């Protein structure tokens, strides 16, 4: 009776320069009218796109980044980092029997007051000459792994901003360092940062946004 | 650990129990260490540790109350403070 898609105008999404394939895609919204402005009503939205899409490589196909729009520049949407997560297939593909699982999480603020909960998951590695079926680590050892796992998680996030941290998340620097420092304790495999959560944001700094958008 | 060293000093060394004896021992300079219970009044505590500053005597702050300090000394009564005149077989003075 009205054809409701008559006043939907498409806007273009832009990912930050920390990401390579910055053209995430397009959206729709009711066109800017006198009462409600589309510019105001479209910010704060969350876009969930696979890390393989924003980077090209197919090795990141199991990590997906949430992108939050915080400002609109005419027809272009300027977004910011909102979080990290694994795909349900991948985490299931890692949790097998006869092996020990260890998880750790910690809350820490970045250089510019970005409070985050970082979730890291690791598994015991099976030796190549191993005969016995089960690869079980003692609970005291897993406490040592978790305790080491949090302090490195704290150290590498509080000393760098989110953009510097996001540039640490792309190659999994922390994942490589967690595995490196736990070598003396127990051989670990598939060490990952399986989730990053934005808890609290400070006052919006439009200057720092454009610094990550040109 | 400290409760063990303090207990050893009781059965072996010399000590005085009570506020009046502790101040009287600090006046003569015979005190090697002063121990003050947690719930000692702050006014009394602050002037026990004023004499120790004058007497050049270390002060140890016991974590229990005068009830727990008393029972550490083997006493069936409350000991708000004590001074160790002669550490005996123990080494509490060098441990503090």
């Amino acid at each position: 009776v009205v054809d409701p898609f008559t006043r939907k105008d498409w806007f273009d999404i832009k990912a930050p320069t920390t990401f390579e394939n910055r053209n995430v895609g397009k959206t729709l919204i009711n066109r800017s009218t006198g009462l409600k402005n589309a510019a105001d009503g479209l910010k704060g939205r969350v876009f969930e796109v696979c890390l393989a899409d924003l980077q090209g490589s197919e090795d990141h196909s199991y990590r997906k980044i949430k992108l939050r729009v915080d400002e609109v520049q005419g027809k272009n949407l300027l977004t910011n980092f909102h979080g990290l997560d694994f795909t349900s297939d991948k985490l299931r593909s890692l949790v097998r029997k006869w092996q020990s699982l260890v998880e750790a999480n910690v809350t820490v603020k970045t250089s510019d007051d970005y409070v985050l909960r970082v979730f890291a998951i690791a598994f015991t590695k099976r030796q190549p000459n191993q005969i016995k079926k089960t690869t079980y680590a003692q609970s005291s050892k897993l406490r040592e792994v978790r305790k080491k796992m949090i302090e490195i998680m704290q150290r590498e996030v509080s000393n760098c901003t989110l953009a510097q941290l996001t540039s640490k998340l792309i190659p999994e620097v922390i994942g490589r360092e967690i595995e490196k420092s736990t070598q003396t304790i127990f051989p670990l495999q598939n060490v990952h940062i399986r989730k990053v959560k934005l808890l609290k944001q400070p006052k919006f700094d439009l200057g720092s946004l454009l610094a990550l958008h040109g | 650990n400290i409760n063990s060293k303090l207990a050893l000093t009781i059965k072996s060394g010399k000590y005085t129990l009570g506020y009046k004896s502790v101040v009287k021992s600090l006046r003569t300079g015979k005190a090697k260490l002063v121990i003050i219970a947690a719930n000692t009044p702050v006014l009394r505590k602050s002037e026990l540790e004023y004499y120790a500053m004058l007497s050049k005597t270390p002060v140890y702050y016991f974590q229990g109350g005068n009830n727990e300090l008393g029972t550490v000394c083997g006493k069936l009564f409350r000991v708000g403070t004590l001074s160790i005149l002669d550490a005996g077989d123990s080494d509490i003075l060098s441990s503090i």
Binding site: - | N39, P41, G65, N66, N67, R78, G80
Partner: protein
């Protein structure tokens, strides 16, 4: 000898008011007439004045407490909560 098998301090009420109401009174009236250890001077000389007022005969320190006990359950929970919230805020 044991003068009363079960009524205890509520033996002053005789047979009146019902057993259930007498049992609820006994729990709290034992507590409000008990002597508690003073946290300031260390002696067991703290007794109730009016409700919420607990005086120590020795050191003459008066503390605000519960109606029938020197410390209520919620007060101790709050003291630890405030102690915890205090140390985080001040690092």
């Amino acid at each position: 000898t044991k003068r009363t098998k079960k009524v205890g301090i509520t033996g002053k009420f005789g047979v009146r008011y019902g057993s259930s109401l007498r049992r609820q009174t006994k729990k709290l009236e034992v507590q409000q007439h008990a002597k508690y250890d003073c946290s300031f001077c260390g002696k067991r000389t703290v007794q109730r004045g009016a409700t919420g007022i607990w005086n120590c005969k020795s050191c003459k320190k008066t503390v605000a407490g519960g109606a029938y006990t020197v410390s209520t359950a919620a007060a101790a929970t709050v003291r630890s909560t405030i102690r915890r919230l205090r140390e985080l805020a001040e690092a």
